[PDB]
């Protein structure tokens, strides 16, 4: 037992009363008084006392007392004395069934946070207490017990699944299932909500009972209560993903019931139902079980893709046309998003088979006079595009012109979704004669880039970037107009849209390439970019996209970038240097210095490597005057994989040109580069192989010692078929380059790498990397034919992969083929290939 003193109790009640004042100064001052009184050992005990024994006090005061006790728990429970902790536990369990739903909710969260803050083994009797209390004859105790149980199961599923308190679930799951029968709908909702927490974990206590679970779940399917239907749909989604075998016998009835729920009047029930279509489309059996239901399902999903009245109001689409929280509200998942995504995945799985069901609906929506219906039709046409392109093509000559008209529609929403749909059909648009569809499309899209409405602007920029990626060189005749409008966009845009504008400009540079290097384009594009570059300070996060954009420009312009190089270069160095400095400082004293944002040095290395790539030898007079070398060395010493990746990329680029200044540091680079290679941080390993290739081909025969330490690691990488194709291809390329410059160490290894070397390099398009790698393998076979006797078929395949190679490479292949045809076998090898490859071999 414990008792309060009257004056202290009354002072605490007065503070709780004053905590409800509208005056923020009163709130702050009484919060301060409370934070001070928290020092009192039994303050929390008075607080629970107000929550529980003073039934005479008004419910808001009691509720807030409970909530602030919950905060005190979360912050300080570890230093509560045992007496008050026991009082809290016992008393809140005594009042878990209090009449007021508000009091019962506060007590529920208080119990939940006590149990979560401590370990359940700090309160071992809690679960038996709640389980036994579920059997209450009084309703309120039962309801509160089950509510707190639901919260505990949601917060603490894993700890309940552990051996902690002797597998409690083994008794609870039979209990919860037994309460699916309960008369009160709220109790049934709690029961299903609790059981649902243990489906995805595949908890044995439940999976030992899935038959009873699904039987009672179907017995419960017909409930009137929206919460019950919500939780039943959620349970069936999870069970589909996990224990699909049991659901499969009843899949037809489950599908029909879940479609009925997809049409449910309550929006939450409908959303839960739509998740069923998304998850089912991911199971391999979907294309066989759901076909019979498509004619009933597609019209439903389509009908679900209309905006709700609430979305139309929030989007202000209702308004004539002559913010951040708006986005927060719209973006959040809803029935429209989910229906569109479900239709998208259904399109991906059924492809042309789904077209004859949706197309009659689509050709009604597209030309409907209600703008909401038209908008949903545009969204439908855009959603199925990716999966259904091959069957949709015949109608594009008819639809694309109307979509291009819709880009001029009065309603902003129609305009935006039209931009996105045309983006989805960009590839087919590009395939056609430019003057027929591409030029009108880009004209309208650029007119919308400067639209009045910001989401229209964002949609237009995204669509134009995708269209550029499809168009590539097709853009060049229109490049003046593209640049004019984009650089005008800088003068209009605002920060939220400015990053997608950067996306558009960077994509333009990437797709156009050296064609962008004209004086008018340079003096039109650069001034605003360097204006933003001067505007931003080194600490601004908005600097990440800009540099990520600028690098593209810098490479696309190649030497044309030179007048703007030096101030960029210098700053780009300083950034990484700073991030290194603080980083090591943070490593020395984490309390004195926080870990700096690695993204600055990552993007700085990326931009600097791209700058070296673009400028070639012209960057030598800068890197000679810089500490850059040491810095990137440290960047490859750093454990973080991204900086290692970026620094090896920069090493490769500074090796393509200006290697003469890198060379003295090779003795320091190579040991750590080879060491970093093998652990196979996929991107880091890939760049490490490629850097080894560059530095080896630069070094020549002088590379003697660095070959053994890398070659064993490289062939070990080739030993792993799990390597992604790019990494393995570059490993083979660098093996070839090493075999070219230093054969003697590679001489034993031909048999170990030639086969995957062939199967990888046969699919790279005859560039200088492939040229040097094949030169290397030719050198290797000339040095050791014995290593490829059992593998000449792979050599023939690799040599045949070349389409009209250089004359000297052709002669090397020719001479070595006429060599090992003598040194039947060559005829049989060439017979393994189709007419083209065999003919190429014969011509050689």
């Amino acid at each position: 037992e414990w008792k309060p003193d009257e004056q202290g109790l009354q002072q605490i009640l007065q503070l709780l009363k004053e905590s409800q004042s509208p005056d923020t100064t009163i709130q702050r001052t009484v919060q301060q008084k409370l934070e001070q009184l928290n020092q009192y050992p039994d303050f929390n005990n008075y607080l629970i006392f107000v929550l529980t024994k003073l039934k005479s006090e008004d419910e808001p005061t009691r509720s807030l007392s409970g909530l602030i006790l919950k905060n005190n728990v979360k912050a300080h429970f570890q230093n509560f004395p045992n007496g008050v902790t026991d009082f809290i536990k016992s008393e809140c369990l005594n009042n878990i069934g209090d009449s007021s739903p508000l009091i019962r909710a506060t007590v529920g969260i208080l119990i939940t946070t006590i149990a979560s803050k401590g370990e359940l083994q700090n309160w071992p009797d809690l679960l038996p207490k709640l389980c036994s209390l579920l059997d209450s004859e009084d309703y309120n105790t039962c309801e509160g017990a089950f509510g707190a149980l639901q919260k505990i199961c949601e917060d603490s599923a894993e700890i309940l699944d552990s051996d902690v308190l002797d597998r409690p679930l083994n008794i609870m799951i039979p209990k919860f299932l037994q309460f699916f029968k309960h008369s009160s709908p709220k109790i049934r909702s709690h029961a299903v909500a609790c059981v649902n927490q243990f489906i995805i974990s595949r908890t044995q206590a439940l999976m030992l009972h899935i038959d009873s679970f699904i039987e009672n779940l179907f017995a419960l399917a017909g409930d009137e209560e929206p919460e019950v239907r919500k939780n039943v749909c959620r349970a069936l989604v999870m069970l589909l993903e996990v224990r699909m075998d049991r659901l499969l016998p009843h899949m037809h009835n489950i599908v029909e019931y879940m479609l009925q729920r997809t049409q449910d009047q309550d929006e939450n029930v409908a959303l839960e139902a739509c998740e069923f279509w998304l998850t089912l489309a991911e199971q391999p059996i979907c294309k066989d079980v759901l076909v019979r239901h498509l004619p009933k399902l597609i019209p439903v999903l389509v009908n679900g893709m209309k905006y709700s009245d609430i979305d139309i109001i929030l989007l202000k689409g209702d308004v004539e046309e002559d913010e951040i929280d708006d986005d927060d509200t719209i973006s959040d998942w809803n029935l429209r998003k989910c229906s569109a995504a479900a239709l998208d995945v259904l399109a991906n799985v059924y492809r042309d088979e789904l077209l004859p069901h949706i197309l009659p609906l689509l050709k009604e929506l597209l030309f409907h006079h209600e703008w909401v219906v038209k908008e949903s039709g545009i969204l439908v046409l855009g959603a199925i595009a990716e999966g259904c392109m091959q069957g949709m093509i015949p109608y594009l000559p008819e639809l694309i012109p109307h979509l291009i008209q819709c880009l001029s529609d009065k309603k902003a929403l129609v305009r935006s979704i039209t931009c996105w749909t045309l983006s989805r059909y960009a590839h087919w648009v590009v395939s056609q004669p430019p003057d027929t569809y591409l030029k009108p499309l880009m004209t309208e899209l650029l007119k919308r880039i400067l639209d009045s409405n910001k989401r229209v602007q964002e949609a237009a920029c995204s669509a134009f970037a995708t269209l550029e990626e499809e168009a590539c060189t097709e853009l060049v005749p229109y490049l003046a107009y593209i640049l004019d409008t984009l650089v005008f966009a800088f003068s209009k845009y605002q920060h939220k849209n400015l990053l997608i504008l950067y996306d558009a400009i960077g994509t333009l540079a990437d797709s156009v390439g050296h064609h962008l290097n004209k004086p008018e384009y340079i003096q039109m594009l650069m001034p605003p970019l360097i204006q933003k570059w001067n505007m931003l300070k080194d600490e601004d996060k908005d600097l990440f996209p800009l540099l990520e954009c600028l690098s593209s420009v810098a490479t696309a312009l190649q030497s044309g970038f030179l007048p703007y190089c030096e101030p960029v270069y210098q700053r780009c160095v300083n950034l990484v240097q700073k991030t290194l400095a603080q980083a090591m400082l943070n490593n020395a004293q984490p309390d004195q210095y926080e870990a700096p944002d690695k993204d600055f040095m990552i993007v700085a290395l990326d931009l600097l490597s791209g700058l070296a790539e673009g400028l070639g030898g012209n960057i030598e007079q800068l890197v000679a005057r810089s500490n850059i070398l040491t810095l990137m060395y440290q960047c490859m010493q750093d454990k973080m994989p991204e900086v290692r990746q970026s620094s090896f990329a920069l090493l490769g680029d500074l090796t393509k040109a200006c290697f003469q200044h890198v060379k003295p540091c090779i003795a320091d680079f190579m040991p750590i580069l080879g060491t970093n290679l093998n652990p196979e941080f996929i991107s880091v390993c890939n760049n490490a192989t490629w850097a080894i290739g560059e530095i080896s081909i630069q070094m020549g025969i002088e590379m003697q010692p660095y070959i053994p330490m890398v070659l064993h690691q490289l062939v070990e990488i080739i030993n792993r078929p799990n390597t992604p194709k790019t990494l393995l291809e570059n490993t083979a390329i660098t093996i070839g380059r090493l075999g070219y410059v230093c054969p003697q160490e590679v001489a034993p290894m031909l048999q170990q790498f030639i086969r995957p070397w062939c199967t990888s390099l046969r699919n790279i398009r005859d560039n200088e990397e492939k040229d040097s790698a094949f030169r290397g393998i030719c050198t290797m076979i000339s040095v050791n034919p014995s290593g490829v006797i059992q593998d000449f078929i792979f050599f023939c395949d690799a040599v045949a992969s070349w389409i009209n190679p250089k004359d000297d490479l052709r002669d090397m292949f020719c001479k070595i083929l006429h060599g090992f045809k003598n040194q039947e076998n060559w005829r049989r090898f060439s017979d393994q290939f189709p007419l083209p490859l065999k003919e190429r071999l014969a011509a050689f």
Binding site: W333, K337, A341, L379, A383, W420, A465, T466, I500, D503
Partner: peptide, 12 residues
């Protein structure tokens, strides 16, 4: 990598 879309799930 991929651009914003109309049916993108929060927490891409």
């Amino acid at each position: 990598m991929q651009r914003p879309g109309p049916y993108d799930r929060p927490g891409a």
